[PDB]
């Protein structure tokens, strides 16, 4: 059998049924909504997952602590289906691509109910992070519900890049500014949660939330399926936002190590990952899979952004552990 720990809403429904059905290997699917939740289980140590999926910065600190056995790439033949230029971008956390295979990647930004926003904000354009980070905008959007992510790794590097500071700064003076920005709009945040906005956007409970690329595209497509006239949209603000990459990695204390390789060779297939991305709303690392994908996903500039959009997006860096504590303190101070 095989045990997996992946994000919420991050796989097509029949991907597993197809896998077991082809290979015979029965799967157990466990889920988490933040990077910290996963990272916490990893130092617990005895978390018995054969396949876990961190983000690009989190992966690098967990390598430097020896959590994931090396990749026996002899058992990953479809490894060459991977974008060569994607891999090299992620040597900054995994040198020489030794431990982690890419899965899905995307951005993060604003997801909003167009009707309920313009109702409370008029024709003001939703294009600046100042929608969420300015009290004069938030004080009114607060009747309609705003949702931040419960993670200092998302909320704080976003507030930094909003003011124009370095989102990967090590400076306590900077986090000071970002802190007292967030703590001036906190009275209007209806909750901090990295996942329960997807459903909460489609059902009209909130009208704006800090969200991920596909999370919102999911939330939108969920909304119209319900067929009640909820227009959910996703807009990467003008100040840019966080670009990231999630990668699958086999822990050291894992035991279905072979089964884990087979499941990862079946997701390097340009056919399957298409079905995954087509459903979840995130771009994958298999270039051969785009010609096979639903166009509205494989053609979207917010799913697959162009360079001009990229050339102003920050990639979270492997921060010194001194600084991570400044994050966690500052973010818990906002609580």
């Amino acid at each position, epitope marked *: 059998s095989l045990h997996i720990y992946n994000w919420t809403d991050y796989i097509a429904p029949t991907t597993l049924k197809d896998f077991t059905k082809e290979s015979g290997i029965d799967v157990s699917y466990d889920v988490f909504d933040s990077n910290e939740t996963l990272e916490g289980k990893l130092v617990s140590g005895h978390s018995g997952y054969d396949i876990v999926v961190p983000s690009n910065n989190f992966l690098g600190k967990q390598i430097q602590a020896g959590a994931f056995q090396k990749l026996d790439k002899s058992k990953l033949p479809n490894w060459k289906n991977l974008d060569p230029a994607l891999l090299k971008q992620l040597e900054v956390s995994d040198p020489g691509n030794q431990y982690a295979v890419p899965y899905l990647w995307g951005t993060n930004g604003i997801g909003y109910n167009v009707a309920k926003v313009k109702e409370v904000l008029g024709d003001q354009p939703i294009d600046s992070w100042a929608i969420l980070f300015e009290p004069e905008n938030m004080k009114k959007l607060a009747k309609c519900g705003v949702a931040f992510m419960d993670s200092g790794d998302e909320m704080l590097p976003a507030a930094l890049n909003y003011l124009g500071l370095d989102p990967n700064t090590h400076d306590p003076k900077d986090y000071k500014k970002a802190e007292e920005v967030l703590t001036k709009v906190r009275p209007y945040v209806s909750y901090f949660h990295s996942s329960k906005y997807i459903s909460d956007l489609a059902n009209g409970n909130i009208c704006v939330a800090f969200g991920y690329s596909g999370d919102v595209f999911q939330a939108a497509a969920r909304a119209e399926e319900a067929g009640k006239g909820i227009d959910i949209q996703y807009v990467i603000p003008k100040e840019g936002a966080n670009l990231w990459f999630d990668l699958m990695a086999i822990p050291a204390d894992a035991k279905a190590a072979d089964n884990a390789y087979a499941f990862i060779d079946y997701l390097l297939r*340009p056919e399957v990952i298409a079905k995954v991305s087509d459903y979840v709303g995130y771009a994958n690392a298999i270039p051969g899979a785009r*010609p*096979l994908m639903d*166009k*509205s996903v494989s*053609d979207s*500039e*917010e799913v697959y952004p162009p360079q001009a959009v990229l050339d102003k997006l920050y990639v979270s860096a492997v921060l010194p552990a001194k600084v991570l504590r400044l994050q966690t303190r500052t973010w818990t101070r906002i609580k």
Partner: single-chain antibody
Amino acid sequence: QVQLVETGDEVKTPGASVKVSCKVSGYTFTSYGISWVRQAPGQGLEWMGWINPNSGGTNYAQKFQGRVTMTRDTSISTAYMELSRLRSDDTAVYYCARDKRYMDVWGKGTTVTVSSGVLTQPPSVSGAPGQKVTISCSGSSSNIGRNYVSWYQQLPGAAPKLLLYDNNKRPSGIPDRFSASKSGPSTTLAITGLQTGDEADYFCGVWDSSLRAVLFGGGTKLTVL
């Protein structure tokens, strides 16, 4: 080399039914999609449907679902489109294009003649040799606004060619003069050292994420003096 070869050519009665085969050569057939672009005489390109040759997926333009059917013998690397209430209208050349989001290699087109009984784009521009000229194409948040765009150049009597992809990328061969720009819901092609050989119809093509079709521009005819 990479080519699609299309069917024989076919005269058909107003109640009928036509099948157009399309055989691909010299590329992993199951790797790229396939697209059907119809063109009535004297008018523009029209999206019909897209078939995923790997999984049999069928995206029919809403105008044709209920009358079109798209299939594929993977064994013999071909695709099939069947219209099924041939009308005084459908008289057209039926082109067949390898779809990699855009359509880089086009077939040569099959003609159906049935006899018995969108995107605001300007209709034509006229320019002098040497000068620069522009062609716009205005969509919406559903289309030019959200998704990547493709520009196609149809020289006289020829099947459409790929001029630009990925909002503004040039295929090997398309020279420097041809480049596109993009703001909000508009993409504006602009040819610079306007030669004589550039006399043609130019079409923008995007995917409208709400209608679920590859919306073409009405087309502009370019006459160079």
